[PDB]
Amino acid sequence: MEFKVIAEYFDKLEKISSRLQLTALLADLLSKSDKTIIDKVVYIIQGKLWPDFLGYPELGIGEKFLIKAISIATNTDENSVENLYKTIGDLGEVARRLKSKQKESLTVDEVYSTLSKVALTTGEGSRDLKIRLLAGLLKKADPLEAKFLVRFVEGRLRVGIGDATVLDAMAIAFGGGQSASEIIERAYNLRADLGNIAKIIVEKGIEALKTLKPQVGIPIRPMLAERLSNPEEILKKMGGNAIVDYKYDGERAQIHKKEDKIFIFSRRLENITSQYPDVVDYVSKYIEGKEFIIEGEIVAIDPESGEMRPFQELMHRKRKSDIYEAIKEYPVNVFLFDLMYYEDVDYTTKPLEARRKLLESIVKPNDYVKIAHHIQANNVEDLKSFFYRAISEGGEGVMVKAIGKDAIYQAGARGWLWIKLKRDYQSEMADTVDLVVVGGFYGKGKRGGKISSLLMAAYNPKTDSFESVCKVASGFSDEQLDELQKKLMEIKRDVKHPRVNSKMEPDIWVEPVYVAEIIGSEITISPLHTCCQDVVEKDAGLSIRFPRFIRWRDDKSPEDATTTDEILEMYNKQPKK
Numbered sequence: 400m401e402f403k404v405i406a407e408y409f410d411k412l413e414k415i416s417s418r419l420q421l422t423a424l425l426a427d428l429l430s431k432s433d434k435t436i437i438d439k440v441v442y443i444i445q446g447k448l449w450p451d452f453l454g455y456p457e458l459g460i461g462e463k464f465l466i467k468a469i470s471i472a473t474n475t476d477e478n479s480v481e482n483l484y485k486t487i488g489d490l491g492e493v494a495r496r497l498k499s500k501q502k503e504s505l506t507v508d509e510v511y512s513t514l515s516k517v518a519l520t521t522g523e524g525s526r527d528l529k530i531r532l533l534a535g536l537l538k539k540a541d542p543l544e545a546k547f548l549v550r551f552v553e554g555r556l557r558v559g560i561g562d563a564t565v566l567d568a569m570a571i572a573f574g575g576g577q578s579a580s581e582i583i584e585r586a587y588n589l590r591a592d593l594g595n596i597a598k599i600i601v602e603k604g605i606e607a608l609k610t611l612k613p614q615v616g617i618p619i620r621p622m623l624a625e626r627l628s629n630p631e632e633i634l635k636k637m638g639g640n641a642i643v644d645y646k647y648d649g650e651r652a653q654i655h656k657k658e659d660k661i662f663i664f665s666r667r668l669e670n671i672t673s674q675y676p677d678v679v680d681y682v683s684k685y686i687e688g689k690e691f692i693i694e695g696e697i698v699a700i701d702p703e704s705g706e707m708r709p710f711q712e713l714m715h716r717k718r719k720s721d722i723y724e725a726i727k728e729y730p731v732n733v734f735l736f737d738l739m740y741y742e743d744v745d746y747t748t749k750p751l752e753a754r755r756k757l758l759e760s761i762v763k764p765n766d767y768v769k770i771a772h773h774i775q776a777n778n779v780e781d782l783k784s785f786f787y788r789a790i791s792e793g794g795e796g797v798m799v800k801a802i803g804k805d806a807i808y809q810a811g812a813r814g815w816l817w818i819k820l821k822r823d824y825q826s827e828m829a830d831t832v833d834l835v836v837v838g839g840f841y842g843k844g845k846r847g848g849k850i851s852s853l854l855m856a857a858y859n860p861k862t863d864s865f866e867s868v869c870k871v872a873s874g875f876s877d878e879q880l881d882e883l884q885k886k887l888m889e890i891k892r893d894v895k896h897p898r899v900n901s902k903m904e905p906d907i908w909v910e911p912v913y914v915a916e917i918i919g920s921e922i923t924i925s926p927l928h929t930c931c932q933d934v935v936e937k938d939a940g941l942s943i944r945f946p947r948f949i950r951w952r953d954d955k956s957p958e959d960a961t962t963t964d965e966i967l968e969m970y971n972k973q974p975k976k
């Protein structure tokens with residue numbers, strides 16, 4: 400097979416405007432390709448030599464060094480080669496024009512062979528080898544061939560076709576028409592390597608693809624989540640039943656291991672292994688298993704506290720020269736959330752529970768690789784509780800995931816099996832306030848030993864008083880639920896403090912001291928509470944509906960709380976009906 404045809408492809412691609420003609424052009428090119436080397440063809444027609452995930456270098460040479468390469472291939476001093484480039488504005492064209500002014504033609508094999516060396520050769524003395532190898536190619540090349548060999552090496556193969564475009568064309572060229580798209584797509588999704596799929600399509604035929612499994616070391620197109628803002632709507636989609644994860648803020652890492660070598664692929668299936676040698680160490684030390692494909696989120700962590708840091712910090716890491724310094728300043732934890740392949744077995748077809756049960760049991764307990772924080776939500780309340788616990792930890796929200804026989808790994812597609820629940824609750828019933836704890840209630844029944852309920856109040860600057868707005872029961876982690884007793888008991892008083900007024904009698908009265916961030920749905924009228932007494936309706940005060948404890952405020956004094964006037968301004972701006 401001769402490179403001539405590929406040069407024709409690129410040249411005509413520059414001329415045509417019809418998606419139809421494009422499909423015809425590629426399908427033709429492909430079918431008239433050589434079955435032996437389709438796996439190279441499929442990337443060259445894009446302007447690459449290999450897929451991104453391999454992690455090989457981008458083909459590149461200095462512009463000053465191309466000018467010498469052309470000058471050599473044409474017998475023309477770099478001086479006059481420089482000038483045509485000034486006037487014209489494309490080195491390929493310049494190269495083409497210099498050839499047509501003056502016995503075996505080029506083969507695709509020798510191009511791919513040569514261009515690999517050029518990409519692959521680095522270190523002392525490579526400059527000169529690149530220059531001489533290119534010159535060789537260009538010399539052997541005919542006019543049009545040259546022009547496009549230049550653009551190719553320059554990166555400037557614009558083109559704008561990608562894997563998807565090629566699959567579509569392979570259906571047309573090899574599957575015998577459009578209907579064959581589904582299968583090719585399916586396979587590619589499980590094995591995101593155009594050349595490998597192409598090779599199978601050609602050698603074993605289109606039918607082979609139907610039973611194709613993933614291959615450790617070649618990435619799976621990631622599964623993607625839908626988005627809804629309503630938690631009730633979400634669980635209805637899940638059959639009232641879901642696994643709910645914290646939505647982590649970090650690098651979406653797909654981790655492969657085969658016998659001993661480890662591979663980390665990015666959200667976009669870039670090879671990011673050499674950026675995370677600590678994750679490599681972590682994986683081999685703490686994840687039991689011969690060979691597998693798993694995925695999780697890599698997350699910047701705080702040296703001390705180990706609070707999570709936002710994604711932007713990992714980005715900063717990527718720009719550090721001393722990797723050992725990079726890791727000191729930007730350590731990392733890995734939160735795993737799925738498992739697609741374990742020891743020669745494809746797990747993509749098995750329920751989420753299954754994949755997770757396995758996933759968990761292979762993680763040796765350590766401080767660096769952990770399972771995503773999660774619960775099984777059996778009602779909306781569970782989902783809501785956890786979601787607010789998530790945003791509470793500065794989180795962006797949660798990933799709600801279906802369970803059962805349908806709950807498979809939908810490689811490369813966006814669908815309703817995973818659904819994100821994000822801060823977007825902003826566009827829903829939400830209003831956030833800072834209230835002062837004025838007292839507490841004991842629980843009820845078999846676990847009613849604890850104080851599990853707080854009387855929250857708002858500040859009234861005119862009267863220097865605190866006026867109750869809501870009784871709060873939910874939002875506390877069990878841990879925080881207990882820190883409460885000793886925290887509250889320490890400031891217990893036998894009678895209501897003179898600066899707090901509430902028509903509600905809690906079990907214990909307390910000193911107005913602690914501030915908590917409360918979130919609710921709307922502000923409603925209530926005979927039970929005193930805040931904004933009689934201002935909107937007589938014999939009743941304002942109240943926070945469906946309040947949820949979120950945080951504590953050590954940086955807020957009681958007088959720094961949300962005011963009664965603020966509660967009114969908030970009320971007064973809600974729709975009338």
Ligand SMILES: Nc1ncnc2c1ncn2[C@@H]1O[C@H](COP(=O)(O)OP(=O)(O)OP(=O)(O)O)[C@@H](O)[C@H]1O
Pocket residue numbers: 622623624644645646647648651666696736771798819
């Ligand atoms: N527990 C988790 N389970 C599944 N995916 C998670 C989890 N935590 C984070 N992610 C992933 O992180 C990414 C979420 O990023 P974000 O919310 O910005 O979506 P996006 O970048 O707008 O779109 P995309 O979902 O295509 O990334 C998704 O790839 C999502 O699958």
